[PDB]
Ligand SMILES: *CC(=O)N1CCN(Cc2ccsc2)CC1
């Protein structure tokens with residue numbers, strides 16, 4: 001029993017982290033096979049970050065300008081290219097610790113673990129979600145860029161995030177491992193405001209199921225609702241509209257607990273309308289939305 | 305910027321996890337050098353757990369009864385002994401992935417990371433604290449026993465926790481790596497109630513400092529207080545009494561922010577007395593007490 005914000009074991013990713021230095025800029029790189037992936041802004045001076053022309057800046061760089069260090073061992077760069085907002089540095093040695101991996105571009109509401117690194121050295125691991133506004137709420141200081149987000153299915157690491165920038169509101173933006181930003185963000189020091197941070201309704205419901213499975217049942221009520229009625233309430237509270245797809249995905253949690261998805265929606269509706277009245281649910285005083293239905297089933301079933 | 309509940313990178317510990325089977329019971333073991341550490345209740349049938357005599361039960365067990373599997377490779381047991389509530393199984397092979405390590409017995413209020421494992425296989429990592437009642441609030445299903453809690457200082461893993469049991473209130477009890485339970489708990493299926501779960505005042509203050517460092521300042525007020533006055537308020541709200549030792553430990557955070565510890569106590573006092581009024585602090589609607597001053601400085605300074 002008990003339910004905790006839980007990250008994937010980080011070892012498989014720790015083995016992929018290197019330091020990338022271009023001139024006087026240091027950040028993190030991801031070494032998979034004989035390629036090191038890092039944010040292209042490694043090539044920039046802070047001066048450059050106001051309106052960088054990355055193709056023009058990159059012409060001035062040679063393979064020997066990219067200093068790549070794995071532990072205290074230097075890797076030899078034999079090639080470099082820009083793909084969108086990331087650099088791929090070809091090194092002369094395959095990473096012996098390369099796990100099975102995939103590159104995946106996640107959707108908003110999807111959760112992942114982040115291994116925060118400084119100088120190619122892991123400092124810690126925490127769990128994130130891709131917000132509906134394509135930001136993530138991270139913990140990232142200067143030097144953390146190139147830190148990656150990932151899911152693990154048994155032996156296969158699916159890399160979904162690379163950290164690139166902090167908005168002046170202290171939220172985080174980055175790319176998939178093809179170097180394409182999530183959302184409308186650009187790797188330039190300009191005016192970039194996040195949109196509405198809407199609550200991931202399907203994740204909140206999954207977490208309410210997790211609460212019931214673990215003894216927290218006080219918010220269960222005598223009511224039911226319809227998708228259309230629930231959604232009127234979701235609209236008012238900046239929740240994502242609930243779809244039949246969300247209802248289907250919650251089916252296993254519905255089945256295990258014997259609480260109809262729409263009944264749990266009517267519970268969520270009363271919580272939105274009435275608040276927690278100073279009570280808590282799984283040790284939280286607000287409605288947690290960074291557990292997916294898949295996350296809840298995993299943690300409740302003990303999958304490795 | 306941003307501040308997240310953050311666990312140590314788990315790789316060094318992932319490399320120490322094995323499966324221990326005695327008869328029909330399977331749980332996790334910790335392989336350091338040529339010793340595997342596991343909870344002694346591995347030797348029990350559920351029948352045995354009502355009033356086990358571990359010394360009597362252990363006489364019936366030989367080295368060949370302890371099945372120890374690291375990945376898909378079996379380790380040869382060449383010796384076994386009981387130390388308090390843990391078994392030490394001597395194996396004929398040193399774990400090649402043994403990190404630098406220490407065994408430490410932590411105090412209440414101290415935080416650590418847990419690598420939840422099933423069948424010697426890591427499922428995830430999360431951050432805990434030793435509660436003032438010597439429970440921890442974990443995420444642990446059947447088969448998770450022998451999962452360990454740890455801190456990392458650069459290269460050295462300090463093992464502080466091994467998971468042994470769940471109280472019928474869904475909180476967790478376990479041992480240091482010498483097999484001594486935290487608090488009054490025993491590895492028997494009997495009536496064991498947790499004491500008062502008091503709030504770790506020094507951790508809450510550290511987290512309020514983390515909030516200021518990251519832009520959340522709305523709760524800063526015009527007041528100050530004294531230790532004695534603050535403590536009257538802590539008593540009423542089941543907070544640990546604040547000592548000069550706690551004030552000293554918060555000195556670096558005081559220094560960096562320019563907010564006197566006692567001023568921050570007067571902020572905490574108003575929050576205890578008035579509530580959050582539906583506001584949040586670092587994305588929480590309650591007062592977080594599972595970040596130590598050391599944790600806040602680490603995450604705010606980017607130590608690896
Ligand atoms: C994540 C990280 O380490 N940093 C430091 C370098 N910064 C360069 C930049 C990119 C967009 S605006 C300026 C990014 C944050």
Ligand SMILES: *CC(=O)N1CCN(Cc2ccsc2)CC1
Pocket residue numbers: 331345353444445446447448449450467468469470491492493494
């Ligand atoms: C942690 C874990 O896997 N388990 C399963 C075995 N249980 C045995 C027991 C110990 C005290 S009461 C019964 C403990 C929980």
